[model samples]
Target: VRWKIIESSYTFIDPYNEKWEFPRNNLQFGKTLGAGAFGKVVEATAFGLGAVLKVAVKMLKSTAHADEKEALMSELKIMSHLGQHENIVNLLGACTHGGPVLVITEYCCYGDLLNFLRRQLSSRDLLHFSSQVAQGMAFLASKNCIHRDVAARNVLLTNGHVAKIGDFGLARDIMNDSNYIVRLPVKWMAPESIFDCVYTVQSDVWSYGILLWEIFSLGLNPYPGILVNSKFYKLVKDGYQMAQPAFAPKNIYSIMQACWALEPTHRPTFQQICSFLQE
Candidate 1:
């Protein structure tokens, strides 16, 4: 079967003008990496340019429809414009061919950061990991990209313990606006994001606070014992904040508090967060 690029109706600021095509015959699948609502990611090898490349291929289900296809294309376009950043996952190529569309990226041996944190890490190591994520986010902020999802699960770690931000499916360029309205991640979302559906780099800053909690707590779920319903929003609006993780140092927890500031403007930028970590 031959695959064709589905023409996108949306225009990108820095459009990915090049044609992308991956022949199905040159790709080989290996073990299953993980699965999600959209599809499964699996280990794969692609033969190209006189060498075989080991990559993590995200295969969209065979039953995907037009909307899903468009979303996949949008993600590809965004990654292409973002280009390569040490803290951002690198997109190798994509297979838009006949069936089971695949997005290929460099494989991270250490997998997701949530699982990686499950193993013990020293305070110094924790600060290093958080700083790397902040750097990746700072790069995105510089590009006017709003990573709607900024949690441990979306952070990937290489064999050397380097953290790279992944999962751009929910990310969007803020464009010229202060914020964009979209569906929110209930648990990790900021109050404004949950209440107004407004998302910005500041809202991401709020999520980063929760991410810091996740790191220091070693991957425990946020808002424990609090139901994820309207009550959660009310509590947050009423100034409820997660208690500092026992493992987090005073300085680190203070940074988390600053990120969780009620007013979006009060939260620190990723650059500021990086500076705080370094201090």
Candidate 2:
């Protein structure tokens, strides 16, 4: 069913400078990778740069509203700028020619971080993976970008367990002093995000803390028994924190605790996080 784009105060338009537009015929669709609020991702082959590369295509539904399309384009613009980092999933090109709109990017053979962690992750590998994510987040933080959803589910793992942050649908630029009021992942959100709808780099750090927990727990849901409702907010307000994962190193768990600081200012920057991980 077709949906109309709901008009909002936010303005997001194509910059028209970067040449990321791709011909739809160049992509050969394969198996479905996953589906989310925005669209479904599928495995595809993209012919480019004198080689046929295996890629993941984010296919926007034909029935999506205009705002959804704008959101996708906005994300494309953001990726176009942020994809150069080693730990970020690179945007190869995009197809707006016909049929479903598609965004092509390098495919991670091992899929998301949670799935990769399920298969024989040693302590060394966990630390390495977590550090890689921190590097990516640090890069974004440097660029004034805030990845609202910073969790294992959004991290893609390539060969050799290289972690790349993906899924920018919920991401935003915090360069302006603006408050964003949107639905958030309750278990991963910071207290300010839950109570004040204030999303900053600090909020992302909080989510990263939960992400570290997920990595060590081998993909277990955060706050296992707590319902993701109003009650969850109360629990967080009361200073509830997840227990250390059985396999997490003491030093690593200490970093997680730092990220969980109740005051936003108390959380470490991504740069600080990387330093701690390296130590």
Candidate 3:
């Protein structure tokens, strides 16, 4: 792809840090995983990491809209600081030398978490997901990062159903104002998140509750029959909460209810959630 922009192209050094600099030729782009206006997430192989690693690479076309560039680069910048964790997607490196930008990450062989849920996952299997995600969010909270899109769909499963939080397109590093104005999934979002466009560690806890329900419900869409409109926002703001999924036990239901508490202060911290699930 370096040929596309021959005049200006060279090894595009990572202005962010040298730590994540990757070689262009070391990456072999493979099957298309998903694609959109911005770029494509393709299955790839990264030879630089020593193990002949199977990797997922995000290829961002230069001609993509400015908005896409902002989001893609933001994810790259923010993750550069967040560092690596077991429960989080590891940002291996980026190959910016070629015409198109490449963001590489380790592949989860087991694929999407929802696909696992839709199958015959027992209560033990479901609780395993709950604990792993709680641990993942715990790590995010500790890092002052808000994974704005915390849902089953954003989760990937590694071998042994190890859940790791991925798809950080909406994740934010909230150092100043915890409030961020962005369009988000209303059904998975908290009341304040829906009404105020405010995001906080607590509101993330709220989404995790919905995500827990999401997993146990076999990936059922939250707020089943309701439309996301003015009334939906009012209902959430006015104290409406969805009933427990039939599959999740009462104890797990109790944890979710604690997260959905009306006031942000009422919700337990991710550390607390991890403690509950770890038990």
Candidate 4:
């Protein structure tokens, strides 16, 4: 579609103000689909090119922090390199319109995996869910990328069986060359990352444990009913890890524990996880 520039910040319009006066009518913003701390996702259509195209537009809140720009840029850079995979979210393009920036992506009609599991998944489906997670993670690892954030909220499902990893805002490119480590989410993060220590492929393996639990539990919030962040921190510090419910099968529980092993090296890689879940 021939998308006309709709809006841009005044600060960057100095010499191009005349050129920026072009009126835009091709882009249509529909109802909002979701909102988060930094932005709102809307259902929109880009027209003017030829036919209308349905897209999910993530418009940054007017008061969004400057860091959000960097975050989106990171996501764009990482996603652009990702080829078509059954379990990876596809990236479209971006827009700088209205009063804020917008990142466009494929609209996951089923919403996030968390919502799907909460409403549709059952104890018998645990193996299916675990295998899907492993497959997605293996695909990501094969790309020499790390999904620093692998929680349920970021896993989007298609229909009821396919789980695709989304929200690359936290992903980093390892280039399959350097072993450079980075700190990630503490709650679902590997301990090495918690201490700001070096991370390797193993750190990601550590997170897979929690991802498995989240799936088996049908997207229940991790450390559920734990209200405060400090309490969560205290629990983590005191060696309080997730206690698998009775519903989780012994084999799956063992897999989850291996992922959260204290030493990063002890964690199983995506390859092993996929193999174990398949068997």
Q: Tens digit of lDDT per residue, candidate 2, span 29-148?
A: 899877645566789888873288898888665556887877777667667765488898888888766665677788899878876776645788889999999999888777667777
Candidate ranking under lDDT, highest first, comes to 1, 2, 3, 4
Q: In terms of lDDT, which candidate is stronger, 1 or 3?
A: 1
Question: Over all chains combined, what TM-score does candidate 2 have?
Answer: 0.86
Give the TM-scores of the predictions, in the order they appear: 0.85, 0.86, 0.85, 0.71
Looking at model 3, the pairs that clash are: none
Instruction: Give one digit per residue, the lDDT tens place, for model 3 in 224-265.
Output: 878767887789888888889989898999999999999999
RMSD of 3: 8.7
> What is the C-alpha lDDT profile of model 1 across 1-279, one tens digit per residue?
001122232324544434456676788989987764455678888898127887778766666677877767767767666678899887887777676567778888888888788764788888888999999988878777777778887788886889988764422222221222233457788889788977888888999999999999998888877767677778899989999998899899998899899999989999999987888
For model 2, the superposed segments whose C-alpha errors exceed 4 Å read: 1-15, 98-100, 168-183
| Model 2 clashes, total count | 0
Spell out the clash pairs found in candidate 1. Answer: 3-98
List where candidate 4 sits over 4 angstroms from the true fold: 1-27, 46-53, 64-67, 96-101, 168-185, 197-200, 224-240
Off by over 4 Å in 1: 1-16, 19-22, 98-100, 168-184
